[PDB]
Amino acid sequence: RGHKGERQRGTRPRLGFEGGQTPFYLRIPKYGFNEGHSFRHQYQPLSLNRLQYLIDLGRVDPTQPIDLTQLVNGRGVTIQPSKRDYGVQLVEEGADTFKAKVNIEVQMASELAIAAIEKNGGVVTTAFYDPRSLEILCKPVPFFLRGQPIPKRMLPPEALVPYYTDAKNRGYLADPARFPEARLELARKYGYVLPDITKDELFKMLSTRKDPRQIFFGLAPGWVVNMADKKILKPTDENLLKYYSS
């Protein structure tokens, strides 16, 4: 412990304290850096490299439509809504090497990523989930043990609306009239022949959407999953059905 002084007695001052000269961490001026950080949106990145590697080893299967829950279940990605993760974003890291044909749904995507999926004859769509929704979507089985109905999917807030309304982004709220046009525009720009998705045998799976108000595939807002009996329960009431279906 040394000898006498403040240190041998155990009393030396707190951490930032410099001995009375104005502390370093306090002489520097305040500036928004971390300003409003808790409210920023966070999209966990997923490269085409990892997606391909996941398909190749048969963690996710390209056969059925790939959404967030499928990515989570393959542990290809990890989402923590508590940290304001709003979902997966698709990045182009493996674009040149990406040979798989998929129906994929992510919450953000880059032009190059999209192009890279189109070239192989698949379909990309950007969908939005609110925090509560997202939480339920990533970990469904713990939600079904909760004993609650399946909540409505919320809309995007005013900031994110212009993103999800554009066919540019293949937004889930976009006008499908614009889709083939923009989709072709991509193929002009990156110089590849755009396949006709219509004439494919898996096409029925490729067109599959969700309702903008719906969390899962083939379930509906307001149902209740009884997992011990392997039954679904649906409201017959008029008010309930009006509320959940609005």
Partner RNA sequence: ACCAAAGCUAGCUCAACAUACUAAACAAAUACAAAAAUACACCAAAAUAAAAUAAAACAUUCACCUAACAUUAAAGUAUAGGAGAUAGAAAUUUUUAUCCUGACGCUAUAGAGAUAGUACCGUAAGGGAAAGAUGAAAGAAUAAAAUAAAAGUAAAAAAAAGCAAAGAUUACCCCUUCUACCUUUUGCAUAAUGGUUUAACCAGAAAAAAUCUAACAAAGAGAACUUUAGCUAGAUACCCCGAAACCAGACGAGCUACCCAUGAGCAGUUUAAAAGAACCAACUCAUCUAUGUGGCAAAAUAGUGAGAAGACUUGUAGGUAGAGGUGAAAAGCCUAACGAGCCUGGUGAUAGCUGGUUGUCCGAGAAAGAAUUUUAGUUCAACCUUAAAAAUACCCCAAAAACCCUAAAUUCCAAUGUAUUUUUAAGAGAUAGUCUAAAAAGGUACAGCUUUUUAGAAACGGAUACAACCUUGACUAGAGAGUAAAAUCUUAAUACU
Partner RNA sequence: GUUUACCAAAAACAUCACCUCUAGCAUUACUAGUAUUAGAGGCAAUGCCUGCCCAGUGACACCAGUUUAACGGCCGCGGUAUUCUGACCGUGCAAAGGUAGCAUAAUCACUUGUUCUCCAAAUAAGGACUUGUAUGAAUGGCCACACGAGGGUUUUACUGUCUCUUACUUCCAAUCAGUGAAAUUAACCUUCCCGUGAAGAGGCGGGAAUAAAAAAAUAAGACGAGAAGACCCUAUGGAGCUUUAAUUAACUAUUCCAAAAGUUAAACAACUAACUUAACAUGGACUAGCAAUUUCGGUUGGGGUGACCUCGGAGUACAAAAAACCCUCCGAGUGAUUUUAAUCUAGACAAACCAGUCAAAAUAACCAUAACAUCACUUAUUGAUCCAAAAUUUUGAUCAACGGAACAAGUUACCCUAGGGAUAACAGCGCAAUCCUGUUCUAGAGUUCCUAUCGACAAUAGGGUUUACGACCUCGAUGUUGGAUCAGGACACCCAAAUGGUGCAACCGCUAUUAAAGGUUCGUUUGUUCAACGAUUAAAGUCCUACGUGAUCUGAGUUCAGACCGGAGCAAUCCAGGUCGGUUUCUAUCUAUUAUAAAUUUCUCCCAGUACGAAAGGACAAGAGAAAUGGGACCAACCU
5 binds Mg ion (CB under 5 A): yes
Q: In this complex, which beta carbon is closest to RNA, that of residue 132 or of residue 178?
A: 132
Which distant-in-sequence residues (6+ apart) come within 8 Å of 26 by Cβ?
A: 16
40 binds RNA (CB under 7 A): no
Give me the least distance between CB of 81 and RNA, in Å please: 7
Binding mask 60-89 for RNA (x = CB under 7 A): ---------------xx-x-xxxx------
> Residues 7 to 36: which contact Mg ion by CB under 5 A?
11
148 binds RNA (CB under 7 A): yes
Q: After which residues is the chain broken (C to N over 2.5 A)?
A: none
Q: Which of 119, 102, 118 lies closest to 205, judged by CA?
A: 102
Q: In this complex, which beta carbon is closest to Mg ion, that of residue 123 or of residue 134?
A: 134
207 three-class SS: coil
Which amino acid is it at 129? Y
CA distances to 24, 99, 235, 246 from 239, in Å? 62, 49, 9, 11
Q: Which residues contribute to the site for RNA (CB under 7 A)?
A: 1-22, 24, 26-30, 34, 36-38, 44, 50, 75-76, 78, 80-83, 132, 135, 139, 142, 145-146, 148
